[PDB]
Amino acid sequence: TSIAIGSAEGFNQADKAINTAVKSGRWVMLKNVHLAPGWLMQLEKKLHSLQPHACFRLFLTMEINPKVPVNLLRAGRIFVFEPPPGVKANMLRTFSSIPVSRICKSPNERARLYFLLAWFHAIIQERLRYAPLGWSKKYEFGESDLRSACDTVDTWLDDTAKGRQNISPDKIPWSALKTLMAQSIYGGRVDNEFDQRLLNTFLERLFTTRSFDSEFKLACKVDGHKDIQMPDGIRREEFVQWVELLPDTQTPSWLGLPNNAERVLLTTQGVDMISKMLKMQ
Amino acid sequence: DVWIDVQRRWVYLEGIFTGSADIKHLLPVETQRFQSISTEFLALMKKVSKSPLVMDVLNIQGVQRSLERLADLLGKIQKALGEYLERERSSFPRFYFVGDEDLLEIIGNSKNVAKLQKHFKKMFAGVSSIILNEDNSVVLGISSREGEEVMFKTPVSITEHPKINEWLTLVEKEMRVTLAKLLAESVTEVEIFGKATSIDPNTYITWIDKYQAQLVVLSAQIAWSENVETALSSMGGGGDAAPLHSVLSNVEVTLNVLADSVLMEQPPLRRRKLEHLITELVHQRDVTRSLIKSKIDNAKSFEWLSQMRFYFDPKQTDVLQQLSIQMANAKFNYGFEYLGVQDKLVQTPLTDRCYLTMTQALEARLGGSPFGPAGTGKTESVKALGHQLGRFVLVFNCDETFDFQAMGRIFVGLCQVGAWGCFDEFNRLEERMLSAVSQQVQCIQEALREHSNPNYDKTSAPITCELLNKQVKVSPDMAIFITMNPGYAGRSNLPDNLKKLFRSLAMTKPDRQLIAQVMLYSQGFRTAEVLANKIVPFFKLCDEQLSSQSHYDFGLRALKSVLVSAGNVKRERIQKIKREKEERGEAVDEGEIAENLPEQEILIQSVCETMVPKLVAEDIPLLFSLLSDVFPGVQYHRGEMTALREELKKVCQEMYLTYGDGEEVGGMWVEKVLQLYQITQINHGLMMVGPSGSGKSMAWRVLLKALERLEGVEGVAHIIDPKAISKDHLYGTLDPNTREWTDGLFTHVLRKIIDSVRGELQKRQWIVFDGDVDPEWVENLNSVLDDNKLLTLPNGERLSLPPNVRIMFEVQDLKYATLATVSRCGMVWFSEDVLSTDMIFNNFLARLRSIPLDESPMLQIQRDAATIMQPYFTSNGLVTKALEHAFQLEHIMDLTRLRCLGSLFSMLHQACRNVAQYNANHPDFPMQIEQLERYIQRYLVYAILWSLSGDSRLKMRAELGEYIRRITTVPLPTAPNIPIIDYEVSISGEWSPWQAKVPQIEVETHKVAAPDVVVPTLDTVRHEALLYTWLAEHKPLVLCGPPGSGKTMTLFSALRALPDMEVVGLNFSSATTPELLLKTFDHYCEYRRTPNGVVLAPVQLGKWLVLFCDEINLPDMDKYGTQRVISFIRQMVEHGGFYRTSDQTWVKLERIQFVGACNPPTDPGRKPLSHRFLRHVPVVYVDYPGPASLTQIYGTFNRAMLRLIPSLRTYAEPLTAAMVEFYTMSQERFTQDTQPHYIYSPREMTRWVRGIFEALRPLETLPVEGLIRIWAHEALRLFQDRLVEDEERRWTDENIDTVALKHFPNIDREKAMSRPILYSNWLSKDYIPVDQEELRDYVKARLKVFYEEELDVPLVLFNEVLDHVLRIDRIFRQPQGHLLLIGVSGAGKTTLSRFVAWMNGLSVYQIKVHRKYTGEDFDEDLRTVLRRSGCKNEKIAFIMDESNVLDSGFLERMNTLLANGEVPGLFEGDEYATLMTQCKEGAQKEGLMLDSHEELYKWFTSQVIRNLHVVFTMNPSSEGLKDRAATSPALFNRCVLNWFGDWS
Amino acid sequence: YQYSLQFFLDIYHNVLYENPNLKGVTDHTQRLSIITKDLFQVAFNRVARGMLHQDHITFAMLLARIKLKGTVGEPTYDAEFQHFLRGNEIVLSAGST
Ligand SMILES: Nc1ncnc2c1ncn2[C@@H]1O[C@H](COP(=O)(O)OP(=O)(O)OP(=O)(O)O)[C@@H](O)[C@H]1O
Ligand SMILES: Nc1ncnc2c1ncn2[C@@H]1O[C@H](COP(=O)(O)OP(=O)(O)O)[C@@H](O)[C@H]1O
Ligand SMILES: Nc1ncnc2c1ncn2[C@@H]1O[C@H](COP(=O)(O)OP(=O)(O)O)[C@@H](O)[C@H]1O
Ligand SMILES: Nc1ncnc2c1ncn2[C@@H]1O[C@H](COP(=O)(O)OP(=O)(O)O)[C@@H](O)[C@H]1O
Ligand SMILES: [Mg+2]
């Protein structure tokens, strides 16, 4: 049972759902509970004096803000959701989120398109850490954009490939996908001409007929002369294995940024870690 | 006025109760009620029919009462039909968008279709009215607002479908079907028009005229899409000859025909059709050129797929499904909703991107959320896309009152109708409401998704969703769009779950050049590209180079208004040239006239009619330089509106205003009036921006009168102060329980105009918002100021702004208004230089020479005085030079020209009244012209001095007097050093010193330091005269100065000279609202319905009510710098009344005036008063009495005091000197910088004298040493009790000793000033000093008795306990003696207070605060305390703690009780009646025979003051003390503060 | 980062009992070593799940310090960690460089 917190009817429905679930054993999710900090204390007191069913689970979705009561935080288990630490983690999360049966469909080229989409999303989202250089402002490039891009890819691949097992890479609607990503999916959030130019550059570099060649370069000159290679696989599991075997030595040059784009950030983070460890001495 | 409303209500109520048959079962009781009421109504109608004479009907007994009762009963019945209204809305989905009153009218008038013709504009997109035959039994067709009409293929007959719902649904379905058939025929014709080398203009214009504006553009789009599809299919072979060039040629030749057609004169409907066709074909040409350039040969290429394409299938059986609209992978069906003639928007690439993103969102079954700055066309883009698909788009201007239930009801309406919802400013909702609404949006989207699944079949169960705990069917055509400005920080943030339900899009930079080019091309402007490429950069330069002002807007809206004005100006110029050629010669050629047509000066003329009025003086030459640079060699000359100028002249003469032409006096004001007229002509939303007293109100009033006299159209103005009332009272509120909508002020006014019961649509109606603008209330007018011209309420009701209504704002600044509202209103900038001082002088002199002061010898005196002061009221005169100099000085408040000018004018009116009084007192010898001249000149100098420097210190008053003496030629006093400010003007016409009015009096012994007693001083005699002068004309006035300066004392002494004037005390705090003033009005005044309107006047006939606001500048300023009560007072001063929120009725004040008091605005917690408020209120600075004045005042008090003991009469001078010196050093040493409560004033010295007098009263004899001991004891109790730190107390002790030895040298130290200075009347009858040991023994015995009889907790008697119990005993022995004990918890404050109350016989009362405690419980406790202490004559020690304060209302009520001794609004209704009864028995018991309620309440207040004692105990917090100093000023100026603190 | 005593007790219960690594191990000393290892592992896994990724390194550093204090065959390394934490508080001079 999903309930959005903020209205009196919402509070009554949440109380009724909790009272029903602690007996039946169902699940209850309450969204944006940080908007009612006063009611969270009463909810915690109600939860403490309670012996619910073994299968009952209560989920409280909230944003990280100090208005959430401390007693509620101590009573429950906290799970922080945030951008993945790196490109490898972002791609792994994207592949795990998308069902296996969705990627494995009638055209074998769908897996490569999904891998290109995952890499593009990882590159775009990881550049947001270097806010002034990777972009011009902290855009909300998130899971909704990835889902819309997946839907667009599925729709246009199904339109072009009418159930055929294989489709020529030149026959893939590259222009349709590129334009939709640049205008509606990811370019909708962009309100800067140069951010749009960068997005168009990324889309025209990644989504092209040359992406299906063995020589294709995901990134060029990550350090010295080494560069990231496009996988030669044609199936989802091979792409996932390639993602898992990433060097785990990521630098901002994976994103196209200079290697020195992270020096100030890393120095500040190290100083902040020193301060945090000293604060709990 | 009552008959028509009752008849109108009864018509539709009887219609509903008769036509409907299910209403008898659902709601029978009020059905029977209405049957009886209708029987009475029919009896009345029969009686009227017997004698149709008006006077015979008027002579019917109790006819007015009968009609009022009928109206009340009809209203009660009408409000009792909500469930039936919901039932009726359920059957026909479009009833969800119509109001409750309008639904009542619609259902009641089902039989009489005639009154439904103004209600179809609410349920349909473009259907304003329906077309019926003469029988009114068959619906032949429908009509639009512009007059365009559609005839049904098969007309719907009402007789065959008598039910309102049935025939309404048939009309809607037949409208859709006939639109489909007409579209099919139009496509068939345009196919013949298409694929043609040349187009005959005659047949093309015939086809355009034949079909609707909505259908011609659709047919053109269908034909172009089919042509492009066929051409691309032909090119599909690859490397083939391109027939796409033929399609481009066809588009170009058709556009050439359209341009030729728009060059000449066309009917307005055909002109709009041609404009829409041109706008669409420019986009078609651009798309075709883009297709050709890219070398596109496949019809499946995305560069063609991404475009919007229209496909028509003549083989489709369903005419509604014949047309399919596709763009990218999204496919839509035309809704075929009659849109009328809407304004098409140029299809800019941004609009294209918007179309693509929003259609992609629609296909994926989730809403679209365009965002960006205002003026980017986000809302318009959404409306244009909705109209392109033939959808019904409803626009809602969301605000914080759009709660979960209202938004859910709107969603239910949209789901059932199948309409589009464009929720503008969707982030103005509260975040909790956003989260709650996300649930409903998700359910609706899930229902749409399950509808879109191919497994679902329409023959199966209908798709329904859970909306407001009901099953609501969801039409597939429904869409949800939310447009918001994320940049606005105040706007609430959207939750992530709600944001994921919408597809966002950034609309930040509209393509202004394209829109300008296409708009000018469609209007017939040759060389439109050059004009656009000149005018868009010109707007950029205006934005950049011109100075930054808060009212400047050079965005798309400004250019859009400029372009439409250019089109209108070109049309008017064409008409003028045609009429000139008609009156001279007979040859007319439209082509030649258009060829030699100066379009550049037309564009510049529009720019000047729009940009120039808002320009500041320094920017007009700059903008004209920009015009010269961008458009060289062409000039614009403003039209000479002599017809309006003569009317302006007449109105100015009748209104005593100054008129001027060009560079004459008052010319700039007339130019501003003409600019305001132009902006009114070209806009429906206006703002008059400019500093206070720039002539804005007079400008628009004179404009309204001149327009009324010129055009013959009566003008009505509704002036509303938006910030004087809450937003709920301004716009309306929705009941969370019964879901009943109560109209606000603006909503009621607009609805009354729209309904037009008394022909309000035939009058020029101007709704003026004379008040501050903040983005809380003005953003609700966003949809009103937009083309939408619509007011959307949370209850789903939408009110269209009538074309005769103008929404005007009269503001002094726009520093808090956002660019959203600035871009939505034409601006006229009224600089202060527009209203020159010479014009004000001329207005004052004309009013004096014309308007009599009494209500003619008085008029003759006024004329003579005006003649005498005429030389001094000219430019570069005495008054003007003094005003220029006075602005260089600093004052206690910000100086404004009109405050000083109004003060001076009031003083001159007082001088004229004084001359009239002299003439009346000397009938034999009337005052001669030489005496009159001398008196008037001297009084003019005196009034200039007291008006231009009243709010400044004595030093600057002397400076202004010296400057006047330097510049004036009037004879002046020959005093070598005494300033002119120290002289008055005797009625004989000569200067006399104010010292002659200051006698050295000997106040009576029993009247020593009494509140009524006032020692006469130069400042007192000067301020009393000034206050009498200002109060005589009933002009509101403000006293400014330090606390205890004597402002209230000066005012009450001045009011004592006026016996026809009664004062009512009001004490404002930080939580003060106009509700306090309303309570005062209800208690002291009464509302009566005069024939001219409701008038509020005091109950006492012939008496003027003076409202004394004690602290006028404490009330909190909101985030946008506005005080609601200050705006309220400004409204009732400027406009002489306010608005009654109960019925939105204007109430005019009568015999009511206001007097304000306040500390200087630099003091903590004090906010500066608005310049629009200070304009009407003179400010006088009552400063602290100097050492000489203090020595004189308290010296007299001491001499009167020491007369009790003859042996001490020789010590009055040293005692007064010691008191003054110690008070001065204490004031200097302890300032408010250290602690908020460190305020020392003459009030401390008054207490000092009173305490010494009370100690000395019973003593028969007393040595000097005992007098010194009493003096030191009083000094300690007054100056050391409130001290916090121990060093401060040590300083006070040491300096008390030092002062006592300095001023009394020949006394012994130990006997008079032993450190344990303790005084008590417990051991003995008299207030003699007591030693510590015997006091301790007495307190021990009394504490044993206290344990035996009362609260039993053992206590320790140390020195501090004895001192504190003595202090509390001292306070409890005084009338209106309240306490403020500050110290840590558990220090004994409450226990000692209870012990002293038991000792002094007081009854301890404490409020029993619990969790469920609310304001009503506190009010009941206060009523109980007041009844016990004021009616039963019971001494009560009301002990209150800071923890008992759970609301600011607690503090406000306690502040009022502490200050006045009574709360005005506490006793109302039956409580007031029983209070008066109990007061009557109490007065009878006391021996007083009081008859009326006024003296009963006065006696009750006196009893409460005498008996009730309030003890406030709070912890010693730093910021809490400062907060209390502002939220409760009476806690610090009415309560004695003893700082207990922690135990030492 | 609000954690109660019951959270740590649950971690300790999940380490002592329901531990996959203790399915077929019978030696007491190596069982104790396995329990000690999984104590730190499970503590980090559970706590860092509700922690920002920037504080994961801080918590891991503190856990590593805790383990380092618990090893007999290791120097205290107190001065090194004091210089690592409060190193920047040493006052220097222009001529010192
Ligand atoms: N044409 C005129 N000639 C002379 N005096 C004029 C003229 N027009 C207005 N005045 C006077 O000058 C003053 C202008 O007051 P008005 O209320 O019009 O100004 P305002 O700028 O709208 O004021 P506020 O900002 O306080 O609302 C009044 O005293 C008015 O009578
Ligand atoms: N493509 C367009 N063609 C013509 N006028 C347009 C276009 N886009 C916007 N406008 C005009 O711009 C002004 C502001 O549009 P509006 O929808 O209120 O903007 P926003 O959504 O940014 O507040 C209106 O006069 C509107 O008609
Ligand atoms: N000429 C005077 N005669 C009598 N009392 C005076 C005189 N001048 C000042 N005072 C004293 O100054 C104080 C003014 O009190 P009040 O009128 O309440 O001041 P405010 O209006 O500034 O709060 C009183 O104690 C009053 O007795
Ligand atoms: N001088 C004292 N001797 C004995 N008990 C005292 C003394 N002063 C305070 N108390 C104790 O303080 C408590 C009462 O606190 P109270 O006076 O109501 O607090 P507050 O000072 O905050 O008003 C009782 O326990 C009482 O015995
Ligand atoms: Mg808008």
PDB file of N, CA, C and O and ligand atoms in Angstrom, chain B residues 1010 1013-1017 1020 1041-1050 1108 1110 1157 1185 1190 1193-1194 1197 1241-1244 1246-1247, ligand 3:
ATOM      1  N   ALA B1010       0.168  63.020  40.504  1.00  0.00           N
ATOM      2  CA  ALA B1010      -1.004  62.344  39.979  1.00  0.00           C
ATOM      3  C   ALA B1010      -0.925  62.256  38.454  1.00  0.00           C
ATOM      4  O   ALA B1010      -0.322  63.118  37.808  1.00  0.00           O
ATOM      5  N   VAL B1013      -2.413  65.416  36.981  1.00  0.00           N
ATOM      6  CA  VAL B1013      -1.625  66.662  37.227  1.00  0.00           C
ATOM      7  C   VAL B1013      -0.514  66.791  36.172  1.00  0.00           C
ATOM      8  O   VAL B1013       0.217  65.799  35.962  1.00  0.00           O
ATOM      9  N   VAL B1014      -0.396  67.966  35.545  1.00  0.00           N
ATOM     10  CA  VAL B1014       0.684  68.211  34.540  1.00  0.00           C
ATOM     11  C   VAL B1014       1.308  69.587  34.826  1.00  0.00           C
ATOM     12  O   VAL B1014       0.592  70.599  34.670  1.00  0.00           O
ATOM     13  N   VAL B1015       2.584  69.618  35.221  1.00  0.00           N
ATOM     14  CA  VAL B1015       3.283  70.914  35.474  1.00  0.00           C
ATOM     15  C   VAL B1015       3.428  71.652  34.135  1.00  0.00           C
ATOM     16  O   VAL B1015       3.922  71.033  33.169  1.00  0.00           O
ATOM     17  N   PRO B1016       3.021  72.937  34.031  1.00  0.00           N
ATOM     18  CA  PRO B1016       3.080  73.646  32.760  1.00  0.00           C
ATOM     19  C   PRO B1016       4.509  74.003  32.379  1.00  0.00           C
ATOM     20  O   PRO B1016       5.204  74.651  33.183  1.00  0.00           O
ATOM     21  N   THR B1017       4.936  73.594  31.181  1.00  0.00           N
ATOM     22  CA  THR B1017       6.306  73.895  30.708  1.00  0.00           C
ATOM     23  C   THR B1017       6.231  74.406  29.285  1.00  0.00           C
ATOM     24  O   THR B1017       5.187  74.190  28.635  1.00  0.00           O
ATOM     25  N   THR B1020       5.356  71.702  26.950  1.00  0.00           N
ATOM     26  CA  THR B1020       3.961  71.257  27.160  1.00  0.00           C
ATOM     27  C   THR B1020       3.016  72.247  26.516  1.00  0.00           C
ATOM     28  O   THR B1020       2.080  71.798  25.824  1.00  0.00           O
ATOM     29  N   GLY B1041       8.701  59.928  19.902  1.00  0.00           N
ATOM     30  CA  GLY B1041       9.667  60.322  20.944  1.00  0.00           C
ATOM     31  C   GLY B1041      10.012  59.169  21.863  1.00  0.00           C
ATOM     32  O   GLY B1041       9.403  58.089  21.721  1.00  0.00           O
ATOM     33  N   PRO B1042      10.958  59.352  22.808  1.00  0.00           N
ATOM     34  CA  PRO B1042      11.369  58.279  23.699  1.00  0.00           C
ATOM     35  C   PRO B1042      10.220  57.888  24.619  1.00  0.00           C
ATOM     36  O   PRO B1042       9.340  58.726  24.892  1.00  0.00           O
ATOM     37  N   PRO B1043      10.183  56.636  25.123  1.00  0.00           N
ATOM     38  CA  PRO B1043       9.138  56.223  26.048  1.00  0.00           C
ATOM     39  C   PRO B1043       9.182  57.036  27.334  1.00  0.00           C
ATOM     40  O   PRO B1043      10.272  57.192  27.911  1.00  0.00           O
ATOM     41  N   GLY B1044       8.026  57.534  27.781  1.00  0.00           N
ATOM     42  CA  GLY B1044       7.967  58.345  29.011  1.00  0.00           C
ATOM     43  C   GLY B1044       8.246  59.806  28.723  1.00  0.00           C
ATOM     44  O   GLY B1044       8.328  60.592  29.688  1.00  0.00           O
ATOM     45  N   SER B1045       8.383  60.164  27.443  1.00  0.00           N
ATOM     46  CA  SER B1045       8.653  61.572  27.051  1.00  0.00           C
ATOM     47  C   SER B1045       7.468  62.463  27.447  1.00  0.00           C
ATOM     48  O   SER B1045       7.699  63.655  27.743  1.00  0.00           O
ATOM     49  N   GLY B1046       6.253  61.906  27.454  1.00  0.00           N
ATOM     50  CA  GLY B1046       5.053  62.685  27.816  1.00  0.00           C
ATOM     51  C   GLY B1046       4.090  62.792  26.652  1.00  0.00           C
ATOM     52  O   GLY B1046       3.224  63.687  26.686  1.00  0.00           O
ATOM     53  N   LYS B1047       4.230  61.913  25.656  1.00  0.00           N
ATOM     54  CA  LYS B1047       3.366  61.970  24.448  1.00  0.00           C
ATOM     55  C   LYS B1047       1.897  61.768  24.854  1.00  0.00           C
ATOM     56  O   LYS B1047       1.055  62.607  24.469  1.00  0.00           O
ATOM     57  N   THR B1048       1.607  60.709  25.615  1.00  0.00           N
ATOM     58  CA  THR B1048       0.218  60.425  26.040  1.00  0.00           C
ATOM     59  C   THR B1048      -0.257  61.540  26.945  1.00  0.00           C
ATOM     60  O   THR B1048      -1.418  61.977  26.784  1.00  0.00           O
ATOM     61  N   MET B1049       0.603  61.992  27.861  1.00  0.00           N
ATOM     62  CA  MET B1049       0.241  63.093  28.789  1.00  0.00           C
ATOM     63  C   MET B1049      -0.098  64.348  27.971  1.00  0.00           C
ATOM     64  O   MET B1049      -1.118  65.000  28.278  1.00  0.00           O
ATOM     65  N   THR B1050       0.727  64.663  26.969  1.00  0.00           N
ATOM     66  CA  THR B1050       0.493  65.860  26.134  1.00  0.00           C
ATOM     67  C   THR B1050      -0.819  65.696  25.400  1.00  0.00           C
ATOM     68  O   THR B1050      -1.572  66.688  25.313  1.00  0.00           O
ATOM     69  N   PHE B1108      -6.632  56.153  20.006  1.00  0.00           N
ATOM     70  CA  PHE B1108      -5.240  56.386  20.380  1.00  0.00           C
ATOM     71  C   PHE B1108      -4.488  55.065  20.276  1.00  0.00           C
ATOM     72  O   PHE B1108      -4.618  54.194  21.139  1.00  0.00           O
ATOM     73  N   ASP B1110      -1.289  53.266  20.832  1.00  0.00           N
ATOM     74  CA  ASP B1110      -0.202  53.606  21.745  1.00  0.00           C
ATOM     75  C   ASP B1110       1.168  53.372  21.120  1.00  0.00           C
ATOM     76  O   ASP B1110       2.085  54.178  21.312  1.00  0.00           O
ATOM     77  N   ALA B1157       0.922  57.081  18.606  1.00  0.00           N
ATOM     78  CA  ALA B1157       2.120  57.315  19.395  1.00  0.00           C
ATOM     79  C   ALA B1157       3.107  56.195  19.110  1.00  0.00           C
ATOM     80  O   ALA B1157       2.712  55.063  18.821  1.00  0.00           O
ATOM     81  N   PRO B1185      12.136  65.698  28.745  1.00  0.00           N
ATOM     82  CA  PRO B1185      12.342  67.006  29.352  1.00  0.00           C
ATOM     83  C   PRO B1185      13.804  67.198  29.732  1.00  0.00           C
ATOM     84  O   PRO B1185      14.414  66.259  30.279  1.00  0.00           O
ATOM     85  N   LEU B1190      12.952  69.166  33.896  1.00  0.00           N
ATOM     86  CA  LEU B1190      12.794  68.189  34.967  1.00  0.00           C
ATOM     87  C   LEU B1190      12.907  68.858  36.329  1.00  0.00           C
ATOM     88  O   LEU B1190      12.121  68.572  37.240  1.00  0.00           O
ATOM     89  N   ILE B1193       9.527  70.748  36.780  1.00  0.00           N
ATOM     90  CA  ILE B1193       8.344  69.855  36.988  1.00  0.00           C
ATOM     91  C   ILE B1193       8.418  69.176  38.365  1.00  0.00           C
ATOM     92  O   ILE B1193       7.476  69.368  39.169  1.00  0.00           O
ATOM     93  N   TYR B1194       9.490  68.428  38.632  1.00  0.00           N
ATOM     94  CA  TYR B1194       9.573  67.656  39.905  1.00  0.00           C
ATOM     95  C   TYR B1194       9.882  68.604  41.062  1.00  0.00           C
ATOM     96  O   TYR B1194       9.583  68.248  42.222  1.00  0.00           O
ATOM     97  N   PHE B1197       6.581  69.424  42.267  1.00  0.00           N
ATOM     98  CA  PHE B1197       6.017  68.226  42.946  1.00  0.00           C
ATOM     99  C   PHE B1197       6.609  68.126  44.350  1.00  0.00           C
ATOM    100  O   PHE B1197       5.861  67.828  45.303  1.00  0.00           O
ATOM    101  N   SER B1241      12.950  56.904  32.264  1.00  0.00           N
ATOM    102  CA  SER B1241      12.224  58.078  31.712  1.00  0.00           C
ATOM    103  C   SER B1241      11.712  58.963  32.855  1.00  0.00           C
ATOM    104  O   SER B1241      11.866  58.562  34.029  1.00  0.00           O
ATOM    105  N   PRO B1242      11.109  60.141  32.577  1.00  0.00           N
ATOM    106  CA  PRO B1242      10.538  60.965  33.633  1.00  0.00           C
ATOM    107  C   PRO B1242       9.513  60.172  34.430  1.00  0.00           C
ATOM    108  O   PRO B1242       9.187  60.571  35.564  1.00  0.00           O
ATOM    109  N   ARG B1243       9.008  59.080  33.851  1.00  0.00           N
ATOM    110  CA  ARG B1243       8.025  58.217  34.558  1.00  0.00           C
ATOM    111  C   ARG B1243       8.662  57.686  35.852  1.00  0.00           C
ATOM    112  O   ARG B1243       7.949  57.612  36.875  1.00  0.00           O
ATOM    113  N   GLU B1244       9.951  57.337  35.804  1.00  0.00           N
ATOM    114  CA  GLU B1244      10.660  56.856  37.018  1.00  0.00           C
ATOM    115  C   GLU B1244      10.629  57.966  38.077  1.00  0.00           C
ATOM    116  O   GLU B1244      10.326  57.659  39.249  1.00  0.00           O
ATOM    117  N   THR B1246       8.485  60.409  38.328  1.00  0.00           N
ATOM    118  CA  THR B1246       7.089  60.562  38.790  1.00  0.00           C
ATOM    119  C   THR B1246       6.820  59.524  39.856  1.00  0.00           C
ATOM    120  O   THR B1246       6.274  59.897  40.918  1.00  0.00           O
ATOM    121  N   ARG B1247       7.197  58.268  39.599  1.00  0.00           N
ATOM    122  CA  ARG B1247       7.036  57.198  40.615  1.00  0.00           C
ATOM    123  C   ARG B1247       7.806  57.605  41.876  1.00  0.00           C
ATOM    124  O   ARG B1247       7.227  57.519  42.980  1.00  0.00           O
TER     125      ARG B1247
HETATM  126  N1  LIG D   3       5.316  68.933  32.626  1.00  0.00           N
HETATM  127  C1  LIG D   3       5.076  67.749  33.183  1.00  0.00           C
HETATM  128  N2  LIG D   3       4.170  67.672  34.185  1.00  0.00           N
HETATM  129  C2  LIG D   3       3.934  66.478  34.741  1.00  0.00           C
HETATM  130  N3  LIG D   3       4.474  65.297  34.456  1.00  0.00           N
HETATM  131  C3  LIG D   3       5.368  65.401  33.460  1.00  0.00           C
HETATM  132  C4  LIG D   3       5.715  66.558  32.792  1.00  0.00           C
HETATM  133  N4  LIG D   3       6.672  66.291  31.823  1.00  0.00           N
HETATM  134  C5  LIG D   3       6.882  65.003  31.924  1.00  0.00           C
HETATM  135  N5  LIG D   3       6.120  64.400  32.891  1.00  0.00           N
HETATM  136  C6  LIG D   3       6.134  62.985  33.235  1.00  0.00           C
HETATM  137  O1  LIG D   3       6.577  62.266  32.109  1.00  0.00           O
HETATM  138  C7  LIG D   3       5.922  60.971  32.062  1.00  0.00           C
HETATM  139  C8  LIG D   3       5.217  60.829  30.737  1.00  0.00           C
HETATM  140  O2  LIG D   3       4.399  59.636  30.765  1.00  0.00           O
HETATM  141  P1  LIG D   3       3.586  59.230  29.446  1.00  0.00           P
HETATM  142  O3  LIG D   3       2.674  60.345  29.059  1.00  0.00           O
HETATM  143  O4  LIG D   3       2.998  57.870  29.627  1.00  0.00           O
HETATM  144  O5  LIG D   3       4.771  59.134  28.371  1.00  0.00           O
HETATM  145  P2  LIG D   3       4.842  58.499  26.892  1.00  0.00           P
HETATM  146  O6  LIG D   3       3.596  58.961  26.185  1.00  0.00           O
HETATM  147  O7  LIG D   3       6.101  59.044  26.267  1.00  0.00           O
HETATM  148  O8  LIG D   3       4.886  57.007  27.082  1.00  0.00           O
HETATM  149  C9  LIG D   3       5.026  60.926  33.305  1.00  0.00           C
HETATM  150  O9  LIG D   3       5.718  60.352  34.404  1.00  0.00           O
HETATM  151  C10 LIG D   3       4.758  62.410  33.551  1.00  0.00           C
HETATM  152  O10 LIG D   3       4.345  62.689  34.870  1.00  0.00           O
END
